[PDB]
C-alpha cells in the first residue's frame, strides 16, 4: 500500500521540485498512513508539504 502511494506521489513531487524529487518523495513516504493519504488526496496539501521538505533540506545543509 505504501509502495502504491509512493508510485503516485513521485510524479507529482517531480513536477514541483524535479531536482529533489526522489529525496522528497522518500521523506514523505516515512510519514504516517493517514498523512500520506491526505497528501495524495490534496495537491494543495502536497505542495505545502513538498515546500516544507525543500526548506528542511536547505536548512539542514
From Swiss-Prot:
Transmembrane segments: none annotated. It is found in: Nucleus; Cytoplasm. Residues 1-61 form the PABC domain. Widely expressed. Most abundant in testis and expressed at high levels in brain, pituitary and kidney. Homotetramer; composed of a dimer of dimers. Associates with CDK9 and TFIIS/TCEA1 and forms a transcription regulatory complex made of CDK9, RNAP II, UBR5 and TFIIS/TCEA1 that can stimulate target gene transcription (e.g. gamma fibrinogen/FGG) by recruiting their promoters. Associates with the E3 ligase complex containing DYRK2, EDD/UBR5, DDB1 and DCAF1 proteins (EDVP complex). Binds TOPBP1. Interacts with PIH1D1. Interacts with CIB1. (Microbial infection) Interacts with human T-cell leukemia virus 1/HTLV-1 protein HBZ; this interaction modulates HBZ stability. Belongs to the UBR5 family. The UBR-type zinc finger forms a pocket that mediates recognition of type 1 N-degrons. The UBA domain recognizes and binds ubiquitin. It acts as an ubiquitin acceptor required to place 'Lys-48' of ubiquitin into the HECT domain activie site, thereby potentiating the E3 ubiquitin-protein ligase activity. E3 ubiquitin-protein ligase involved in different protein quality control pathways in the cytoplasm and nucleus. Mainly acts as a ubiquitin chain elongator that extends pre-ubiquitinated substrates. Component of the N-end rule pathway: ubiquitinates proteins bearing specific N-terminal residues that are destabilizing according to the N-end rule, leading to their degradation. Recognizes type-1 N-degrons, containing positively charged amino acids (Arg, Lys and His). This is E3 ubiquitin-protein ligase UBR5. The gene is UBR5.
